[PDB]
Design a protein around this ligand. Structure first.
Ligand SMILES: N[C@@H](CCC(=O)O)C(=O)O
Ligand SMILES: N[C@@H](CCC(=O)O)C(=O)O
Lengths: 257, 257
């Protein structure tokens, strides 16, 4: 039985209503729950969903050099596959493998409706509206590593901001936007942003274009016999239009705004 | 010296003005020429650009089972790397390797301005306007393999259309659109469609959303020592914003419309 690391993130992995009464994998629903089922069917494996204990995507400690989050679970052999909205990055590719992308996305800006912001330049040239990102993920790293002037300005602000503009989870960032009367904006991937925009109370929206262009991949530890089957499975699902059906199912069919 | 297979396709690889006076690689300019230079710099290789002899992207002969085009050049050891708008697909992944995507795209519809078509459904429910794709590529295969009703109908038409609706090159498809007074539409990737829309005489446009979501990758033959360095190089260029800069350079800085 293959241990699948994933993260509680709507609409990828969520608790079913009355999840307490279900056992194991049956506790959960979402895009990545369906993707896990599809891949397992294609490659012929039994699997168990294990929600990442620390609740993080994955970053390397510049102190102890230890990987946390889902990346950590793979690196240290606690899980055999990661089926979550895990961004394909250089630093991660150096320690784990990724399938070709199952979803295409970029960093985006979330505002409370009515906020006078339409771009990253708009954010960077003012101080009245605060903004941040989730911790321990690719978005925080993006700003840390950027040599593009606008993003460097944004990082210089966010890195030193008090109280902290970095949130433990995406949900916490969204809640912060919703409660802050337009005085907090949140930087997050377009996929999560677009989802939230179609959820009650319909008070947030994505503004401007994406800051970058990248993808989520299904990840496996280096040397895994699952590497190739997983990659081919993702491409088959892509080409058969199943990934498009799954996105429509979890983002728009369920649309509430 | 590494042989780089590529294809004459604007704005990826084009002849410089007065190309006859230049030698070797310096005869050429474009997105993929710049990408080749960037990758070679990162991975420390000397290279020679060789335009694919048969002028094809790459498909397998359901008869001889022989791969043609750039895929063929890699499969049969005539080239060591492909740096071109070559789509990452299942069938190709079974015989060659691809880097993670350097560009994201989908199949799209090109029309002569004023053509009463705004979608794939619009095309499929009529017969007055003909439509086709380029031969020996991923777009033709998409329609061949689709089980989506609208696309199945389009394939059933295109496969048996007289005279042939399939063109040898993208340029031939574009010229056919331009010359046909709204009676021909062309199915091609969004990237090439978007490019053409900003080129004189500014008589074409992209209509509707993309039919799929996929990527171009830099390809290497199975067992190549260049596989990992090329993959990491693409991700480095992605993350440094170089891919975005190159797209802006060749599509929009170079806009005529
Ligand atoms: N998909 C991101 C998580 C969210 C973010 O950082 O925006 C990652 O893999 O780290
Ligand atoms: N990018 C395509 C070429 C053109 C097409 O088929 O649309 C390929 O690699 O085959």
């Amino acid at each position: 039985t293959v241990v699948v690391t994933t993260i509680m993130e709507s609409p990828y992995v969520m608790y079913k209503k009355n999840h307490e009464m279900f056992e194991g994998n049956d506790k959960y629903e979402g895009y990545c729950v369906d993707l896990a089922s599809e891949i397992a069917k294609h490659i012929g494996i039994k699997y168990k969903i294990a929600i990442v204990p620390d609740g993080k995507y994955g970053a390397r400690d510049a102190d102890t050099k230890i990987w946390n989050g889902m990346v950590g679970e793979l690196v240290y052999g606690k899980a055999e596959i990661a089926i979550a909205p895990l961004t394909i990055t250089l630093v991660r590719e150096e320690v784990i493998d990724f399938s070709k992308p199952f979803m295409s996305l970029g960093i985006s800006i979330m505002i409370k409706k009515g906020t006078p912001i339409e771009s990253a330049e708009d954010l960077a040239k003012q101080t009245e509206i605060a903004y941040g990102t989730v911790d321990s993920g690719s978005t925080k790293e993006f700003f840390r590593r950027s040599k593009i002037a606008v993003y460097e300005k944004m990082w210089t602000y966010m890195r030193s901001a008090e109280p902290s503009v970095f949130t433990r989870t995406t949900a916490e960032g969204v809640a912060r936007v919703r409660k802050s009367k337009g005085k907090f904006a949140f930087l997050l991937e377009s996929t999560m942003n677009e989802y939230t925009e179609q959820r009650k109370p319909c008070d947030t929206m994505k503004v401007g274009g994406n800051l970058d262009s990248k993808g989520y991949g299904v990840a496996t530890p280096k040397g895994s016999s699952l590497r190739t089957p997983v990659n081919l499975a993702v491409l088959k699902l892509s080409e058969a239009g199943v990934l498009d059906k799954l996105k429509n199912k979890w983002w728009y069919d369920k649309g509430e705004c």
